[PDB]
PDB file of C-alpha atoms in Angstrom:
ATOM      1  CA  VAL A1226     -65.585  40.742  12.087  1.00  0.00           C
ATOM      2  CA  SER A1227     -68.564  38.504  12.971  1.00  0.00           C
ATOM      3  CA  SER A1228     -67.076  34.976  13.399  1.00  0.00           C
ATOM      4  CA  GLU A1229     -64.104  35.598  11.065  1.00  0.00           C
ATOM      5  CA  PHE A1230     -60.671  37.123  11.680  1.00  0.00           C
ATOM      6  CA  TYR A1231     -59.545  39.720   9.127  1.00  0.00           C
ATOM      7  CA  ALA A1232     -56.425  41.711   8.293  1.00  0.00           C
ATOM      8  CA  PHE A1233     -55.588  44.849   6.328  1.00  0.00           C
ATOM      9  CA  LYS A1234     -52.328  45.363   4.436  1.00  0.00           C
ATOM     10  CA  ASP A1235     -51.246  47.349   1.365  1.00  0.00           C
ATOM     11  CA  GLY A1236     -54.710  48.894   0.993  1.00  0.00           C
ATOM     12  CA  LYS A1237     -56.644  45.607   0.815  1.00  0.00           C
ATOM     13  CA  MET A1238     -58.515  43.396   3.277  1.00  0.00           C
ATOM     14  CA  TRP A1239     -57.158  39.843   3.621  1.00  0.00           C
ATOM     15  CA  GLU A1240     -59.354  37.189   5.204  1.00  0.00           C
ATOM     16  CA  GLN A1241     -57.076  34.939   7.256  1.00  0.00           C
ATOM     17  CA  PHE A1242     -57.237  31.170   7.733  1.00  0.00           C
ATOM     18  CA  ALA A1243     -59.220  30.737   4.500  1.00  0.00           C
ATOM     19  CA  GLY A1244     -56.692  30.415   1.645  1.00  0.00           C
ATOM     20  CA  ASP A1245     -53.952  27.905   0.915  1.00  0.00           C
ATOM     21  CA  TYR A1246     -51.323  27.086   3.516  1.00  0.00           C
ATOM     22  CA  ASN A1247     -48.142  29.159   3.956  1.00  0.00           C
ATOM     23  CA  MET A1248     -49.329  31.901   1.545  1.00  0.00           C
ATOM     24  CA  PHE A1249     -49.387  35.269   3.349  1.00  0.00           C
ATOM     25  CA  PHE A1250     -50.692  38.223   1.315  1.00  0.00           C
ATOM     26  CA  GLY A1251     -49.974  36.331  -1.902  1.00  0.00           C
ATOM     27  CA  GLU A1252     -46.344  35.613  -0.934  1.00  0.00           C
ATOM     28  CA  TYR A1253     -44.959  32.268   0.220  1.00  0.00           C
ATOM     29  CA  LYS A1254     -43.255  32.419   3.623  1.00  0.00           C
ATOM     30  CA  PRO A1255     -41.439  29.392   5.099  1.00  0.00           C
ATOM     31  CA  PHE A1256     -42.080  27.655   8.401  1.00  0.00           C
ATOM     32  CA  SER A1257     -39.422  26.279  10.723  1.00  0.00           C
ATOM     33  CA  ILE A1258     -38.954  24.843  14.204  1.00  0.00           C
ATOM     34  CA  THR A1259     -35.776  25.025  16.301  1.00  0.00           C
ATOM     35  CA  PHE A1260     -35.375  22.904  19.436  1.00  0.00           C
ATOM     36  CA  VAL A1261     -32.259  22.417  21.550  1.00  0.00           C
ATOM     37  CA  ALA A1262     -30.977  18.832  21.832  1.00  0.00           C
ATOM     38  CA  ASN A1263     -29.403  18.674  25.314  1.00  0.00           C
ATOM     39  CA  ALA A1264     -29.734  15.232  26.916  1.00  0.00           C
ATOM     40  CA  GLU A1265     -26.958  14.122  29.267  1.00  0.00           C
ATOM     41  CA  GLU A1266     -25.351  17.507  28.697  1.00  0.00           C
ATOM     42  CA  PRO A1267     -22.248  16.782  30.869  1.00  0.00           C
ATOM     43  CA  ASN A1268     -21.303  14.135  28.283  1.00  0.00           C
ATOM     44  CA  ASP A1269     -19.933  14.865  24.815  1.00  0.00           C
ATOM     45  CA  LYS A1270     -22.321  13.430  22.216  1.00  0.00           C
ATOM     46  CA  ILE A1271     -22.144  12.789  18.481  1.00  0.00           C
ATOM     47  CA  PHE A1272     -25.544  13.540  16.940  1.00  0.00           C
ATOM     48  CA  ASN A1273     -26.096  10.711  14.456  1.00  0.00           C
ATOM     49  CA  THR A1274     -29.741  10.703  13.303  1.00  0.00           C
TER      50      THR A1274
ATOM     51  CA  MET B   1     -19.404  -5.025  -8.387  1.00  0.00           C
ATOM     52  CA  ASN B   2     -18.822  -1.423  -9.418  1.00  0.00           C
ATOM     53  CA  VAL B   3     -17.774   1.168  -6.853  1.00  0.00           C
ATOM     54  CA  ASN B   4     -21.249   2.717  -7.040  1.00  0.00           C
ATOM     55  CA  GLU B   5     -22.664  -0.760  -6.444  1.00  0.00           C
ATOM     56  CA  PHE B   6     -20.216  -1.113  -3.549  1.00  0.00           C
ATOM     57  CA  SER B   7     -21.486   2.097  -1.946  1.00  0.00           C
ATOM     58  CA  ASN B   8     -25.172   1.332  -2.499  1.00  0.00           C
ATOM     59  CA  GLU B   9     -24.948  -2.236  -1.192  1.00  0.00           C
ATOM     60  CA  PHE B  10     -22.838  -0.939   1.700  1.00  0.00           C
ATOM     61  CA  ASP B  11     -25.677   1.445   2.558  1.00  0.00           C
ATOM     62  CA  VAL B  12     -28.118  -1.461   2.170  1.00  0.00           C
ATOM     63  CA  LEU B  13     -26.149  -3.595   4.678  1.00  0.00           C
ATOM     64  CA  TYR B  14     -24.878  -0.853   6.957  1.00  0.00           C
ATOM     65  CA  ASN B  15     -27.364   1.990   7.525  1.00  0.00           C
ATOM     66  CA  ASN B  16     -29.894  -0.781   8.146  1.00  0.00           C
ATOM     67  CA  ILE B  17     -31.664  -1.395   4.817  1.00  0.00           C
ATOM     68  CA  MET B  18     -31.243   2.224   3.668  1.00  0.00           C
ATOM     69  CA  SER B  19     -33.345   3.555   6.553  1.00  0.00           C
ATOM     70  CA  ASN B  20     -30.951   6.353   7.630  1.00  0.00           C
ATOM     71  CA  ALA B  21     -31.166   4.818  11.121  1.00  0.00           C
ATOM     72  CA  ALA B  22     -27.405   4.557  11.783  1.00  0.00           C
ATOM     73  CA  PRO B  23     -24.486   7.049  11.766  1.00  0.00           C
ATOM     74  CA  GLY B  24     -24.221   8.662   8.345  1.00  0.00           C
ATOM     75  CA  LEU B  25     -21.081   7.660   6.448  1.00  0.00           C
ATOM     76  CA  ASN B  26     -19.222   9.720   3.849  1.00  0.00           C
ATOM     77  CA  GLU B  27     -17.759   8.471   0.573  1.00  0.00           C
ATOM     78  CA  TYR B  28     -14.172   9.007   1.749  1.00  0.00           C
ATOM     79  CA  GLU B  29     -14.839   6.987   4.905  1.00  0.00           C
ATOM     80  CA  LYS B  30     -16.499   4.223   2.877  1.00  0.00           C
ATOM     81  CA  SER B  31     -13.502   4.122   0.522  1.00  0.00           C
ATOM     82  CA  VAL B  32     -11.104   3.932   3.482  1.00  0.00           C
ATOM     83  CA  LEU B  33     -13.063   1.112   5.105  1.00  0.00           C
ATOM     84  CA  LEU B  34     -13.310  -0.829   1.833  1.00  0.00           C
ATOM     85  CA  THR B  35      -9.546  -0.533   1.303  1.00  0.00           C
ATOM     86  CA  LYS B  36      -8.895  -1.709   4.857  1.00  0.00           C
ATOM     87  CA  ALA B  37     -11.352  -4.554   4.277  1.00  0.00           C
ATOM     88  CA  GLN B  38      -9.629  -5.777   1.117  1.00  0.00           C
ATOM     89  CA  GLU B  39      -6.221  -5.761   2.820  1.00  0.00           C
ATOM     90  CA  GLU B  40      -7.736  -7.645   5.774  1.00  0.00           C
ATOM     91  CA  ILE B  41      -9.364 -10.287   3.555  1.00  0.00           C
ATOM     92  CA  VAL B  42      -6.142 -10.750   1.567  1.00  0.00           C
ATOM     93  CA  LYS B  43      -4.056 -11.203   4.717  1.00  0.00           C
ATOM     94  CA  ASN B  44      -6.632 -13.525   6.309  1.00  0.00           C
ATOM     95  CA  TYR B  45      -7.191 -15.754   3.260  1.00  0.00           C
ATOM     96  CA  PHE B  46      -3.475 -16.089   2.526  1.00  0.00           C
ATOM     97  CA  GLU B  47      -2.628 -17.239   6.056  1.00  0.00           C
ATOM     98  CA  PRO B  48      -4.647 -20.444   6.694  1.00  0.00           C
ATOM     99  CA  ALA B  49      -4.905 -19.705  10.432  1.00  0.00           C
ATOM    100  CA  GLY B  50      -6.521 -16.295   9.851  1.00  0.00           C
ATOM    101  CA  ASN B  51      -9.758 -17.643   8.374  1.00  0.00           C
ATOM    102  CA  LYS B  52     -12.375 -20.076   9.681  1.00  0.00           C
ATOM    103  CA  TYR B  53     -11.679 -22.909   7.207  1.00  0.00           C
ATOM    104  CA  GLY B  54      -7.975 -23.382   7.942  1.00  0.00           C
ATOM    105  CA  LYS B  55      -6.999 -22.954   4.277  1.00  0.00           C
ATOM    106  CA  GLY B  56      -4.468 -20.558   2.783  1.00  0.00           C
ATOM    107  CA  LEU B  57      -3.514 -19.548  -0.752  1.00  0.00           C
ATOM    108  CA  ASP B  58      -3.603 -22.748  -2.838  1.00  0.00           C
ATOM    109  CA  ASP B  59      -5.493 -25.104  -0.509  1.00  0.00           C
ATOM    110  CA  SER B  60      -8.819 -24.922  -2.389  1.00  0.00           C
ATOM    111  CA  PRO B  61     -10.115 -23.656  -5.758  1.00  0.00           C
ATOM    112  CA  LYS B  62     -11.923 -20.736  -4.116  1.00  0.00           C
ATOM    113  CA  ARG B  63      -8.691 -19.276  -2.733  1.00  0.00           C
ATOM    114  CA  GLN B  64      -7.036 -19.752  -6.129  1.00  0.00           C
ATOM    115  CA  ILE B  65      -9.739 -17.738  -7.890  1.00  0.00           C
ATOM    116  CA  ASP B  66      -9.633 -15.200  -5.041  1.00  0.00           C
ATOM    117  CA  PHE B  67      -5.917 -14.481  -5.466  1.00  0.00           C
ATOM    118  CA  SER B  68      -5.902 -15.047  -9.255  1.00  0.00           C
ATOM    119  CA  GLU B  69      -6.119 -11.384 -10.289  1.00  0.00           C
ATOM    120  CA  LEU B  70      -3.248 -10.389  -7.950  1.00  0.00           C
ATOM    121  CA  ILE B  71      -0.630 -12.944  -9.045  1.00  0.00           C
ATOM    122  CA  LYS B  72       2.086 -11.125 -10.994  1.00  0.00           C
ATOM    123  CA  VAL B  73       5.323 -12.460 -12.496  1.00  0.00           C
ATOM    124  CA  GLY B  74       8.186  -9.981 -12.680  1.00  0.00           C
ATOM    125  CA  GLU B  75      11.954  -9.896 -13.024  1.00  0.00           C
ATOM    126  CA  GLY B  76      14.299  -8.580 -10.351  1.00  0.00           C
ATOM    127  CA  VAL B  77      16.794  -5.895 -11.359  1.00  0.00           C
ATOM    128  CA  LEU B  78      20.441  -5.885 -10.307  1.00  0.00           C
ATOM    129  CA  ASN B  79      21.264  -3.291  -7.640  1.00  0.00           C
ATOM    130  CA  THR B  80      24.769  -2.589  -8.986  1.00  0.00           C
ATOM    131  CA  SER B  81      23.863   1.122  -9.149  1.00  0.00           C
ATOM    132  CA  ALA B  82      24.543   1.477  -5.399  1.00  0.00           C
ATOM    133  CA  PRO B  83      27.851  -0.031  -4.160  1.00  0.00           C
ATOM    134  CA  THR B  84      26.284  -1.117  -0.874  1.00  0.00           C
ATOM    135  CA  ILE B  85      27.813  -3.684   1.502  1.00  0.00           C
ATOM    136  CA  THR B  86      26.541  -7.271   1.579  1.00  0.00           C
ATOM    137  CA  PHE B  87      26.515  -9.761   4.450  1.00  0.00           C
ATOM    138  CA  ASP B  88      27.747 -12.689   2.323  1.00  0.00           C
ATOM    139  CA  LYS B  89      30.742 -12.685  -0.001  1.00  0.00           C
ATOM    140  CA  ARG B  90      28.985 -14.282  -3.008  1.00  0.00           C
ATOM    141  CA  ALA B  91      25.732 -12.280  -2.776  1.00  0.00           C
ATOM    142  CA  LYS B  92      24.446 -10.392  -5.829  1.00  0.00           C
ATOM    143  CA  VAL B  93      22.001  -7.726  -4.649  1.00  0.00           C
ATOM    144  CA  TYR B  94      18.742  -7.515  -6.616  1.00  0.00           C
ATOM    145  CA  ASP B  95      15.867  -5.036  -6.328  1.00  0.00           C
ATOM    146  CA  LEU B  96      12.310  -6.382  -6.276  1.00  0.00           C
ATOM    147  CA  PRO B  97       9.273  -4.727  -7.893  1.00  0.00           C
ATOM    148  CA  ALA B  98       7.687  -1.791  -6.101  1.00  0.00           C
ATOM    149  CA  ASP B  99       4.102  -3.126  -6.229  1.00  0.00           C
ATOM    150  CA  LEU B 100       5.007  -6.182  -4.147  1.00  0.00           C
ATOM    151  CA  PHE B 101       2.674  -7.555  -1.461  1.00  0.00           C
ATOM    152  CA  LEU B 102       3.715 -11.181  -0.903  1.00  0.00           C
ATOM    153  CA  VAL B 103       6.254 -13.511  -2.537  1.00  0.00           C
ATOM    154  CA  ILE B 104       5.220 -17.113  -3.231  1.00  0.00           C
ATOM    155  CA  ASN B 105       7.662 -18.447  -5.871  1.00  0.00           C
ATOM    156  CA  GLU B 106      11.126 -17.246  -6.880  1.00  0.00           C
ATOM    157  CA  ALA B 107      13.634 -18.752  -9.305  1.00  0.00           C
ATOM    158  CA  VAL B 108      17.047 -17.908 -10.751  1.00  0.00           C
ATOM    159  CA  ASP B 109      18.441 -18.940 -14.148  1.00  0.00           C
ATOM    160  CA  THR B 110      22.191 -19.577 -13.942  1.00  0.00           C
ATOM    161  CA  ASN B 111      24.730 -20.915 -16.421  1.00  0.00           C
ATOM    162  CA  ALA B 112      24.376 -24.310 -14.728  1.00  0.00           C
ATOM    163  CA  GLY B 113      20.582 -24.182 -14.969  1.00  0.00           C
ATOM    164  CA  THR B 114      17.409 -22.974 -13.326  1.00  0.00           C
ATOM    165  CA  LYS B 115      17.405 -23.256  -9.529  1.00  0.00           C
ATOM    166  CA  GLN B 116      14.389 -22.649  -7.308  1.00  0.00           C
ATOM    167  CA  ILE B 117      15.102 -20.142  -4.546  1.00  0.00           C
ATOM    168  CA  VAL B 118      14.590 -21.070  -0.884  1.00  0.00           C
ATOM    169  CA  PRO B 119      13.837 -18.232   1.591  1.00  0.00           C
ATOM    170  CA  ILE B 120      16.251 -19.131   4.396  1.00  0.00           C
ATOM    171  CA  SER B 121      15.705 -17.972   7.969  1.00  0.00           C
ATOM    172  CA  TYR B 122      18.191 -16.025  10.074  1.00  0.00           C
ATOM    173  CA  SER B 123      18.745 -19.181  12.156  1.00  0.00           C
ATOM    174  CA  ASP B 124      18.990 -21.612   9.236  1.00  0.00           C
ATOM    175  CA  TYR B 125      21.664 -19.361   7.724  1.00  0.00           C
ATOM    176  CA  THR B 126      23.807 -19.638  10.857  1.00  0.00           C
ATOM    177  CA  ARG B 127      23.155 -23.384  11.030  1.00  0.00           C
ATOM    178  CA  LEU B 128      24.119 -24.119   7.410  1.00  0.00           C
ATOM    179  CA  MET B 129      27.090 -21.698   7.366  1.00  0.00           C
ATOM    180  CA  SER B 130      28.724 -23.537  10.308  1.00  0.00           C
ATOM    181  CA  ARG B 131      29.399 -26.611   8.124  1.00  0.00           C
ATOM    182  CA  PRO B 132      32.258 -27.694   5.808  1.00  0.00           C
ATOM    183  CA  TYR B 133      30.831 -26.828   2.394  1.00  0.00           C
ATOM    184  CA  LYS B 134      28.649 -23.772   3.178  1.00  0.00           C
ATOM    185  CA  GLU B 135      26.846 -23.898  -0.175  1.00  0.00           C
ATOM    186  CA  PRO B 136      23.267 -24.793  -1.180  1.00  0.00           C
ATOM    187  CA  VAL B 137      22.185 -28.109  -2.695  1.00  0.00           C
ATOM    188  CA  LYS B 138      22.665 -28.687  -6.423  1.00  0.00           C
ATOM    189  CA  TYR B 139      19.109 -27.604  -7.315  1.00  0.00           C
ATOM    190  CA  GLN B 140      18.368 -24.696  -4.958  1.00  0.00           C
ATOM    191  CA  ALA B 141      19.552 -21.187  -4.126  1.00  0.00           C
ATOM    192  CA  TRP B 142      19.352 -19.046  -0.995  1.00  0.00           C
ATOM    193  CA  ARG B 143      17.901 -15.572  -0.493  1.00  0.00           C
ATOM    194  CA  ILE B 144      18.101 -13.166   2.450  1.00  0.00           C
ATOM    195  CA  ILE B 145      16.984  -9.550   2.794  1.00  0.00           C
ATOM    196  CA  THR B 146      19.559  -6.775   3.214  1.00  0.00           C
ATOM    197  CA  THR B 147      19.745  -2.970   3.268  1.00  0.00           C
ATOM    198  CA  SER B 148      16.767  -1.578   1.348  1.00  0.00           C
ATOM    199  CA  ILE B 149      15.846   2.077   0.793  1.00  0.00           C
ATOM    200  CA  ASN B 150      12.133   2.728   0.065  1.00  0.00           C
ATOM    201  CA  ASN B 151      12.177  -0.607  -1.800  1.00  0.00           C
ATOM    202  CA  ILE B 152      12.992  -4.295  -1.256  1.00  0.00           C
ATOM    203  CA  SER B 153      16.539  -5.521  -1.920  1.00  0.00           C
ATOM    204  CA  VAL B 154      17.410  -9.222  -1.698  1.00  0.00           C
ATOM    205  CA  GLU B 155      20.803 -10.937  -1.424  1.00  0.00           C
ATOM    206  CA  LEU B 156      20.921 -13.825  -3.917  1.00  0.00           C
ATOM    207  CA  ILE B 157      23.365 -16.327  -2.402  1.00  0.00           C
ATOM    208  CA  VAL B 158      23.922 -18.823  -5.216  1.00  0.00           C
ATOM    209  CA  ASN B 159      26.641 -21.473  -5.241  1.00  0.00           C
ATOM    210  CA  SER B 160      30.086 -20.202  -6.197  1.00  0.00           C
ATOM    211  CA  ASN B 161      31.604 -20.683  -9.664  1.00  0.00           C
ATOM    212  CA  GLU B 162      28.222 -19.701 -11.154  1.00  0.00           C
ATOM    213  CA  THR B 163      26.656 -16.558 -12.609  1.00  0.00           C
ATOM    214  CA  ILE B 164      23.107 -15.201 -12.413  1.00  0.00           C
ATOM    215  CA  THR B 165      21.402 -14.338 -15.712  1.00  0.00           C
ATOM    216  CA  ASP B 166      17.778 -13.926 -14.575  1.00  0.00           C
ATOM    217  CA  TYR B 167      15.761 -13.569 -11.363  1.00  0.00           C
ATOM    218  CA  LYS B 168      12.025 -14.158 -11.803  1.00  0.00           C
ATOM    219  CA  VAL B 169       9.541 -13.440  -9.008  1.00  0.00           C
ATOM    220  CA  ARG B 170       5.934 -14.672  -8.898  1.00  0.00           C
ATOM    221  CA  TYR B 171       4.404 -12.385  -6.270  1.00  0.00           C
ATOM    222  CA  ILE B 172       1.037 -11.102  -5.083  1.00  0.00           C
ATOM    223  CA  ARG B 173       0.556  -7.574  -6.397  1.00  0.00           C
ATOM    224  CA  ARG B 174      -0.387  -4.800  -3.988  1.00  0.00           C
ATOM    225  CA  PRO B 175      -4.179  -4.289  -4.291  1.00  0.00           C
ATOM    226  CA  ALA B 176      -5.343  -0.935  -5.596  1.00  0.00           C
ATOM    227  CA  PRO B 177      -7.635   1.286  -3.495  1.00  0.00           C
ATOM    228  CA  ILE B 178     -11.426   1.176  -3.663  1.00  0.00           C
ATOM    229  CA  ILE B 179     -12.661   4.753  -4.172  1.00  0.00           C
ATOM    230  CA  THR B 180     -16.300   5.555  -4.937  1.00  0.00           C
ATOM    231  CA  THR B 181     -15.955   9.176  -6.089  1.00  0.00           C
ATOM    232  CA  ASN B 182     -13.400  11.838  -6.939  1.00  0.00           C
ATOM    233  CA  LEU B 183     -12.237  12.925  -3.488  1.00  0.00           C
ATOM    234  CA  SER B 184     -10.838  16.227  -4.807  1.00  0.00           C
ATOM    235  CA  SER B 185     -14.369  17.484  -5.554  1.00  0.00           C
ATOM    236  CA  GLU B 186     -15.773  17.868  -2.027  1.00  0.00           C
ATOM    237  CA  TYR B 187     -12.668  17.244   0.110  1.00  0.00           C
ATOM    238  CA  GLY B 188      -9.561  19.408  -0.061  1.00  0.00           C
ATOM    239  CA  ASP B 189      -6.693  16.895  -0.160  1.00  0.00           C
ATOM    240  CA  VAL B 190      -7.385  13.338   1.032  1.00  0.00           C
ATOM    241  CA  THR B 191      -6.031  10.080  -0.395  1.00  0.00           C
ATOM    242  CA  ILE B 192      -6.270   6.357   0.343  1.00  0.00           C
ATOM    243  CA  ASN B 193      -2.906   5.079  -0.938  1.00  0.00           C
ATOM    244  CA  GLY B 194      -1.847   8.135  -2.923  1.00  0.00           C
ATOM    245  CA  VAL B 195      -4.965   8.073  -5.140  1.00  0.00           C
ATOM    246  CA  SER B 196      -7.694  10.733  -5.278  1.00  0.00           C
ATOM    247  CA  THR B 197      -9.897   9.610  -8.203  1.00  0.00           C
ATOM    248  CA  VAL B 198     -12.304   6.702  -8.626  1.00  0.00           C
ATOM    249  CA  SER B 199     -10.558   3.324  -8.335  1.00  0.00           C
ATOM    250  CA  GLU B 200     -12.358   0.106  -9.230  1.00  0.00           C
ATOM    251  CA  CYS B 201     -11.491  -2.984  -7.210  1.00  0.00           C
ATOM    252  CA  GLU B 202      -8.649  -4.874  -8.913  1.00  0.00           C
ATOM    253  CA  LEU B 203      -9.825  -8.244  -7.571  1.00  0.00           C
ATOM    254  CA  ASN B 204     -12.012 -11.109  -8.708  1.00  0.00           C
ATOM    255  CA  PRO B 205     -15.762 -10.687  -7.986  1.00  0.00           C
ATOM    256  CA  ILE B 206     -15.564 -13.717  -5.640  1.00  0.00           C
ATOM    257  CA  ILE B 207     -14.335 -11.743  -2.622  1.00  0.00           C
ATOM    258  CA  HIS B 208     -16.230  -8.524  -3.363  1.00  0.00           C
ATOM    259  CA  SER B 209     -19.157  -9.541  -1.142  1.00  0.00           C
ATOM    260  CA  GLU B 210     -16.708 -10.569   1.589  1.00  0.00           C
ATOM    261  CA  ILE B 211     -15.009  -7.170   1.334  1.00  0.00           C
ATOM    262  CA  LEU B 212     -18.395  -5.445   1.547  1.00  0.00           C
ATOM    263  CA  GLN B 213     -19.395  -7.428   4.639  1.00  0.00           C
ATOM    264  CA  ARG B 214     -16.043  -6.842   6.349  1.00  0.00           C
ATOM    265  CA  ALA B 215     -16.332  -3.115   5.633  1.00  0.00           C
ATOM    266  CA  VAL B 216     -19.851  -3.156   7.100  1.00  0.00           C
ATOM    267  CA  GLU B 217     -18.572  -4.831  10.270  1.00  0.00           C
ATOM    268  CA  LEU B 218     -15.677  -2.365  10.520  1.00  0.00           C
ATOM    269  CA  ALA B 219     -18.080   0.565  10.138  1.00  0.00           C
ATOM    270  CA  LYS B 220     -20.426  -0.875  12.763  1.00  0.00           C
ATOM    271  CA  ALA B 221     -17.588  -1.421  15.241  1.00  0.00           C
ATOM    272  CA  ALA B 222     -16.068   2.024  14.686  1.00  0.00           C
ATOM    273  CA  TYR B 223     -19.277   4.094  14.621  1.00  0.00           C
ATOM    274  CA  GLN B 224     -21.649   2.113  16.883  1.00  0.00           C
ATOM    275  CA  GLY B 225     -19.299   0.099  19.122  1.00  0.00           C
ATOM    276  CA  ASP B 226     -17.089   0.582  22.165  1.00  0.00           C
ATOM    277  CA  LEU B 227     -13.431  -0.146  22.909  1.00  0.00           C
ATOM    278  CA  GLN B 228     -14.226  -3.849  23.297  1.00  0.00           C
ATOM    279  CA  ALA B 229     -15.666  -4.049  19.777  1.00  0.00           C
ATOM    280  CA  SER B 230     -12.607  -2.348  18.271  1.00  0.00           C
ATOM    281  CA  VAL B 231     -10.196  -4.614  20.158  1.00  0.00           C
ATOM    282  CA  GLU B 232     -12.150  -7.750  19.240  1.00  0.00           C
ATOM    283  CA  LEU B 233     -12.437  -6.853  15.546  1.00  0.00           C
ATOM    284  CA  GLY B 234      -8.779  -5.830  15.309  1.00  0.00           C
ATOM    285  CA  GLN B 235      -7.865  -9.488  15.814  1.00  0.00           C
ATOM    286  CA  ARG B 236      -8.971 -10.181  12.222  1.00  0.00           C
ATOM    287  CA  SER B 237      -6.783  -7.352  10.877  1.00  0.00           C
ATOM    288  CA  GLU B 238      -3.787  -9.677  10.355  1.00  0.00           C
TER     289      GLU B 238
END
């Protein structure tokens, strides 16, 4: 709507990208990032740090 | 230093200066490496050729204070319970203490008088038993090791026509393990020398820093080194 992106859930309109971080619809949801660590994959590695 | 101090200073020397930039080490592994380190330092500082100074047990005050808290004086017990067979005819078998690491002075009190014991070699025995008299000198007694079963039994070869009333042994006590935390909490069943709970170092604070540094080097070789590092650092294990 205009220059702002809006949402609608549970009977209410939620303006996005305007509140505090990681709070979706009043509830805290986590964030995570998974990335494979495969360098020199023919060799058996011990992941140390 | 306390065992907690041992662990924290170990993580300040190894693990860089507590940067978490080297292989993470557990408390059991740290306890194992500290125990190995204290045995290595004991064996290296007793033998003069194992260290860099060329000095052994009582060659300088520092070594004396190092080994002070391990010197123990105990009496040997007659092994008449087991009718075992001796190698010499006049040998009274005696059992040594269980917590024995290294013997440095032994004496026997006979009816004639106290006589310092001489640890005779397998070759010196054959050399001195090929002579007319085949007995020690007036003021000494011989000792050789014989059949032992999960203990140490010693054959006291004293001159004939005499009786043994006491056998004192001034020996280096076996060091106790260095454990930083109760291993039964996180780990199922793991021990260092038959111990699972916290064990403070039973040594003088002189060699505590040396033990810490040797443990750091052992950890670095094992967890960041190759075969060459292990082989090179195993030289100082004796």
